[PDB]
Symmetry: C3
Subunit: 545 residues, 3 copies
């Protein structure tokens, strides 16, 4: 119903005044809070992070004087050694080998171990060797005087097998400069900036400490920063990376979005000719001469510069913070978990029978028995099999949560449960009687008031004062029903049930065990004698559940 | 104060010994733990993941013999069909159409339905048709004999409308090979590796099962892996993707960082000429002849190869693990939530009046009444309107949480609350009196000890023994105050209040309801008669809150 | 043991029937649930998001008529102004400056303030000025008539210092069109689509409202959308971005994966010649004439178009949802936290001594005293120092949790703890005796039954009826042990301990304080007199812990 909707359930709690546990709780809380704040701040987990969208534009500057034997002096400018940056990469030629006046013809292949012949049996028509730029015609010819080489159809004359010139022809390229312009954007945060801001000095050159924001770089300085020789790499070529890192905060109070420049060599410094060391490619300059289609082939060596731009942009997001705080909230209950674990452990009698005698340091931890007593109440499943038995000659109570398979309840021994703090052959007292229940159910009432021979509880004065005092029982009956008037037999039955309940409460205490207790035949039949029923038999114990 | 800071609050708990609930709890815990660990391991949620920064370098190898009618045999090498990779893409020409000796002149447009004229009225000066490479001069001319075509200013002669040669001139390109070198880096984790490790065989060719790590690829094998014909795609061209996936673990015990190669066609296999099928572009070879600037135009067909590199690098991060564990911790309370829900539901009398008779399987679930009784205590808001009434002729108690609008409290009936387990016209007993309170407040005390006619509770012996026994009341007064001596009137007032409290405790039990109970006028005035006040009137009930 | 494994612990709870607190709880729950669902839906936190892998293919269309004084009319087509897209960028030439017939020679540098000389002393051999394309020879020469300029080795004739032609020669480029084909993939989700779907109109041009999915773009329309003049940018050049955003949902019921097109200028609109405004590069057309190697240098201006493709693909993931729900679960306990805080605060007597008199609105909040009483039980650490004292002439109990340093317990005053609701010189009653304990421990028993002079509690009738009634004590002894028979001295000792316990229970109530209470010497020695021990001395109080 509606009134049941408008309810609040609050947990019952025990507040303990202990320095140890308060100190532990506050220590836990302080450490957890400090770590939570540190993790939130260091990794900015209140921020939503967007990756960078980048555009790069480069401008290389410089000329080189080149000496090539033929000796001639020539000047190379940007139109001769570089092309506009494509795909965030730009290339600078540093060395070249040139092969003028090639024609599509038949020619002898350049002398090598493979191409050196002695007759037309060393060559096969149509042969495509992976190390040749031509197709064999099956007959081998003279390259020069004694030298005999296989004939090929190809661009002729064939390139000579020659190493890259040493020193590199454009070794002056280390004095070339490149200006890098980097445009970035965070489309989700709707923010874009660039690496060159107004006021930036435009005549500087980059230095990691002196000019760490000048976007003009001398190539030799890059190689020096990486620990490489420009002179050696310029001979066979290579690949160098220019890294631009953007760690940007777009909160207007803490706003900072500037690039960090870094350098990394990207080509493997392999010396294995099988892996094609360096960076080179073959380029054809086509031209017509005498109506004959000709080709000048250049083997180009140089350094490719890859501009690598990465990073993130962060702005405060409420949902991310809400998620993080929720992910952290459950860590504040670990103090309670740990302290309750301590209470449960140091309440074990083990921790006092063995541990404390050895480690006498841990002895004051015995207060946890009191704490556990004030914290936890233990109950059992009220199964129909549940039964409780008490012996006057003993000092504990027995939970017979087991089915009597024709065994006298006196014989069946159950679990030992402490009492709350504030003639048959199974009879050890000589005042018990055999049950009148059916033979199947006769064993439940085959119980005596004691385990070992001696006196009977029915002779105790308290038995006559509490269980059998008709005045006490009538007062109890009238307490619930002030104006109660009943017949003789009805009143006798009422007083009989009241006497059963009074005995059970006296001997077992808690109504939990009194509801499932079992009266001895001595006390049972004493009560039934004092308050008999007019006619019929007695049902006996019925489990409430 | 400081001592209040050093406190620990622990929840009071009821420990139940039930196989069903323990089994359910442990089942829940095991399933949740297993799923948590599985999710942590499968998606590596203890790791911080960084995307890959990649650099690619390619080396294509191979020559082709080309037959072009004019028939001539020519050899094409890398300088004739490819250029160094730009932007993680490289191109291989497979077919071409050539148009020699173009001049900037006036010429007839090549015959088509659009360009075919019959007079100068079919053409307009300055016309830029989207399907023409020239600008009309307004007059149409003869292309060949009878054919009449519009004149255009353009590069002349105009290209013929011709389909790509079939078969492709460089169909041998399927035997070309490409070596791919891939450098990758994780700048945050400060890790870089590459796809070619020392010891790798350098003469192999890729195969998904036999050589899945050889970075040398035959192009025809790529197309075969994708399910395409190289011969057909080589005619009009296309785009093919080479995917390099890096799923890298940078934990030094579980370290693995190798690439997985895959292939995907990237061009749409469209046959609609409107959508420009294939891959082709027009390229101009410029040359000077007789001081006349000339152009050889080549329509280039071929396959563009895009190298697509993606992936992540993971290393263990403490903060990510802490966040994940916190996000999971709250799932371990669902067992308690569910079991407490069961206890609350099966404690409803509904579950026994209707459910159990039908479904006799669920009958043993009635233990939850006991469990709920031991778990929850229900209390009400102690509003000033709160009132409790008991009738001796009834068996329950009435909570009149309502304002008496001049209505006798005997008439006003309230909610039925169970009792704790252990003459006026509204008078049905004939010993009640009218109230002496103000007429506004006279209705609160217009209550009888019973709802239906009969005897009076004041005649009950327990009334004289408990409520009026001066010895009992003085013992109660002296229990709190051992050495208590008071005047006659003060003692009478004390005993009067004690008698009120004794009646309320006897009939209503709990002090919660006794504090808000209402004495009947019969018992009220009996008590006031036995312990009168010397002078003045009687205030009556005051709500403690 | 196993039976201890099969246990379920449930929290004891107090269910309150209050409109305010139920309403607050349900308000909290509804708000939290609504926000949780909103955050889940808006940011799709049930989805796993994959970044896009993209391939772009472009097709530019259009011809331009160009007027260059020399006046001549020429037609430029794609082979003359564009090259196939590389690295997701394509370039269109819009302007050019041409320098024909360059030779590697010695020449006078073009006249400028820097290059203008008056003698060979203004020039130095080997000089590489950053603003020169040549190397000085040390001697300066005549450029034209009177003009004197430094001689340089370079490609000669040297380029003239001239501004870009105005108007741009290819200003008709704004009528060029580009068709963009975009292939994307989500490898983890195994999904790929493209921007041109079957049925898409192929004759349209993009418009943000009319044709927002046509992938054909007129360049002038792009610049108009960005708010730029194509005519002005075409003179010196620039860079324009075409953004393709993919916000894709791959759930088959909510599936949507289409691109959103956007435009952004990427070059800085700088007018500083130092920063190299615009976009231009120098390109060499090499040719042989009379066996002399010659060069035609073109300074190329134009607009570079960068295709920027970004986005994410989301598909439902169970683990992400499980993590999010767990991160949110702990927010549903904030209602309990807040309401329990209210209960604790409004239970403070402060909130009634000062607050309510001022703010009489908050007065009904006094029910929280009852709620707190029903919620929390407070206990103290049972340290060996713990002691409780009661004075008959006072109305509270004193917790002396302090070590008596030879100070009489009568003098030592401790914390004031309320009682549970239901002759020596330190003696103010004249019936106390000095202790027989050792002088070190004699001060604990130096306590009287009152703080101020007057009568003694031992004269109270309740003292004789409860503490000394031998019948009461024997009944108490026999309640635990029905058939108890003991010697005279043993029975006297039993009754003495029982009398101590009865006094402590009478005066201190709770067994928690009765276990640590201290009997006055008057009552102590009265009891010891009524139930003496045959021989020896009396130990006295021992702390149970
Ligand atoms: C770690 C747990 C236990 C405590 C939670 C701490 C929060 C209260 C902190 C963490 C992040 C903080 C935020 C970090 C960033 C900003 C942005 C800041 O705004 C700006 O700097 C720009 C202003 C603009 O938005 O235009 C205003 C404060 C605010 C919301 C801060 C408010 C305080 C917050 C929410
Ligand atoms: C799922 C919940 C309920 C339980 C939490 C399990 C953790 C205790 C596991 C998960 C991830 C594990 C870590 C996974 C990876 C590593 C890296 C490993 O280090 C290395 O392999 C490299 C050594 C180096 O750092 O140089 C050492 C163990 C450690 C910290 C593992 C320790 C055990 C961890 C923290
Ligand atoms: C926010 C908290 C408190 C409540 C949790 C809500 C969930 C029950 C919702 C959120 C996301 C939902 C899912 C969103 C997407 C899908 C995919 C949908 O499948 C498809 O659309 C494609 C079918 C296919 O997989 O082929 C089926 C429903 C499902 C699983 C939804 C089921 C209901 C879910 C799990
Ligand atoms: N706890 C408990 N209750 C008992 C025992 N014996 C009888 N009762 C209660 O007394 C009632 C049976 O009383 P009984 O002597 O048979 O009189 P009858 O019902 O008129 O036949 C049942 O409801 C039982 O719950 C017992 O040994 N232990
Ligand atoms: N619970 C309850 N308390 C009552 C009732 N009638 C009187 N009292 C208490 O008794 C006190 C009034 O006693 P009263 O007979 O008027 O004597 P007076 O105070 O000297 O006038 C108040 O504090 C009430 O709380 C009642 O019907 N129910
Ligand atoms: N709480 C409490 N217990 C006491 C006090 N005095 C004695 N006792 C208890 O009584 C026992 C000592 O009794 P005592 O008179 O010395 O007789 P004895 O043990 O035979 O010497 C101890 O176990 C104490 O716990 C007291 O002042 N307060
Ligand atoms: C793409 C090109 C065009 C230009 C610029 C460049 C990036 C370069 C490496 C050199 C190249 C060129 O042709 N440079 N000129 C030259 C090269 C070798 C010897 C003498 C001379 Cl004049 C070819 C080329 C492959
Ligand atoms: C950029 C170029 C330069 C080289 C290499 C390449 C990648 C190519 C496709 C072919 C090209 C070239 O010029 N190849 N040569 C040729 C082409 C057709 C007919 C006869 C011959 Cl010899 C032009 C070009 C567009
Ligand atoms: C790479 C090239 C090749 C083609 C296409 C292009 C992308 C262009 C900008 C123009 C270029 C070319 O040579 N265009 N032709 C021309 C240029 C200026 C004056 C007269 C004429 Cl016919 C050079 C080049 C740098
Ligand atoms: C007497 O029975 C003493 C036994 C104490 C058992 C408790 C042992 C404490 C060690 C931790 C056990 C639980 C694992 C917790 C891992 C963090
Ligand atoms: C007896 O029960 C004493 C228990 C003491 C528990 C402390 C065990 C060590 C764990 C300490 C962790 C917190 C740091 C110390 C807080 C002051
Ligand atoms: C007598 O009143 C029996 C009524 C039982 C009502 C409980 C119905 C159980 C079905 C679940 C209802 C809550 C929704 C839980 C969804 C997971
Ligand atoms: C009476 O209250 C019996 C309640 C039984 C509750 C079980 C309901 C089915 C849910 C089971 C989920 C866990 C799997 C079975 C555990 C053994
Ligand atoms: C009498 O002692 C009244 C004192 C009341 C103290 C409580 C003050 C309430 C304000 C909040 C204090 C806790 C901080 C909570 C921040 C969300
Ligand atoms: C006396 O204890 C009255 C306490 C009232 C607490 C409410 C304080 C304001 C916070 C309200 C937040 C929820 C919105 C209102 C719910 C109806
Ligand atoms: C981005 O910021 C600019 C400058 O304030 C504004 O004009 C524009 O509308 C913003 N775009 C979005 C998507 O809000
Ligand atoms: C990265 O690793 C190398 C090799 O150990 C080390 O020299 C370098 O300092 C590291 N860089 C960082 C940022 O720690
Ligand atoms: Na949580
Ligand atoms: Zn017996
Ligand atoms: Zn017996
Ligand atoms: Zn009446
Ligand atoms: Zn009456
Ligand atoms: Zn005294
Ligand atoms: Zn005294």
């Amino acid at each position: 119903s509606c009134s049941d909707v408008f309810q609040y359930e609050t947990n019952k709690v025990t507040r303990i005044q202990s320095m140890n546990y308060g100190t532990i709780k506050w220590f836990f809380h302080v450490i957890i809070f400090s770590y939570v704040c540190f993790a939130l701040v260091s990794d900015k987990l209140y921020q939503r992070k967007e990756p960078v969208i980048s555009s790069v534009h480069t401008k290389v500057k410089g000329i080189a004087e080149v000496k090539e034997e033929i000796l001639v002096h020539s000047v190379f400018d940007t139109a001769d050694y570089t092309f506009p940056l494509q795909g965030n990469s730009f290339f600078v030629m540093t060395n070249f080998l040139k092969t003028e006046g090639q024609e599509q013809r038949l020619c002898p292949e350049y002398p090598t171990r493979r191409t050196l012949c002695s007759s037309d049996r060393g060559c096969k028509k149509g042969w495509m060797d992976p190390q040749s730029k031509g197709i064999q015609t099956g007959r081998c010819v003279v390259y020069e005087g004694n030298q005999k080489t296989c004939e090929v159809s190809a661009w002729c004359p064939i390139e000579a097998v020659e190493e890259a010139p040493r020193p590199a022809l454009l070794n002056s390229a280390e004095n070339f400069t490149v200006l890098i312009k980097n445009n970035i954007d965070f489309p989700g945060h709707n923010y874009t900036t660039r690496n060159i801001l107004p006021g930036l000095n435009i005549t500087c050159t980059f230095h990691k400490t002196q000019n760490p924001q000048c976007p003009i770089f001398r190539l030799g300085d890059i190689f020096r920063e990486t620990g490489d020789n420009f002179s050696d790499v310029a001979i066979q070529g290579g690949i160098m990376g220019i890294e631009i890192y953007w760690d940007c905060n777009l909160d207007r109070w803490f706003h900072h979005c500037r690039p960090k420049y870094s350098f990394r060599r990207l080509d493997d410094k392999t010396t294995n000719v099988s892996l094609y060391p360096g960076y080179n490619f073959r380029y054809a300059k086509y031209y017509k001469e005498n109506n004959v289609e000709k080709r000048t082939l250049i083997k180009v060596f140089g350094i490719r510069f890859d501009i690598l731009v990465f990073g993130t942009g962060g702005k405060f997001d409420i949902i991310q913070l809400v998620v993080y705080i929720g992910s952290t909230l459950s860590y504040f209950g670990l103090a309670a978990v740990f302290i309750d674990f301590l209470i449960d452990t140091y309440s074990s009698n083990c921790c006092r029978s063995h541990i404390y005698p050895w480690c006498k340091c841990c002895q004051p931890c015995v207060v946890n028995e009191y704490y556990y007593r004030k914290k936890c109440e233990s109950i059992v499943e009220p199964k129909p099999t549940l039964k409780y038995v008490s012996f006057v000659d003993e000092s504990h109570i027995r939970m017979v949560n087991q089915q009597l398979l024709g065994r006298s309840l006196q014989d069946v021994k159950g679990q030992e449960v402490p009492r709350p703090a504030m003639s048959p052959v199974w009879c050890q007292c000589g005042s018990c009687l055999p049950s009148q229940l059916p033979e199947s159910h006769r064993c439940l009432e085959e119980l005596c008031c004691r385990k070992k021979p001696g006196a009977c509880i029915t002779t105790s004065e308290l038995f006559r004062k509490l269980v059998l005092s008709r005045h006490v029982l009538q007062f109890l009956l009238l307490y619930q029903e002030p104006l109660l008037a009943l017949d003789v037999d009805s009143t006798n039955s009422r007083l009989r049930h009241c006497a059963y309940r009074c005995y059970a409460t006296w001997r077992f205490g808690s109504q939990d065990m009194a509801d499932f207790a079992i009266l001895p035949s001595c006390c049972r039949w004493r009560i039934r004698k004092e308050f008999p029923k007019s006619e019929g038999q007695y049902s006996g114990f019925k489990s409430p559940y």
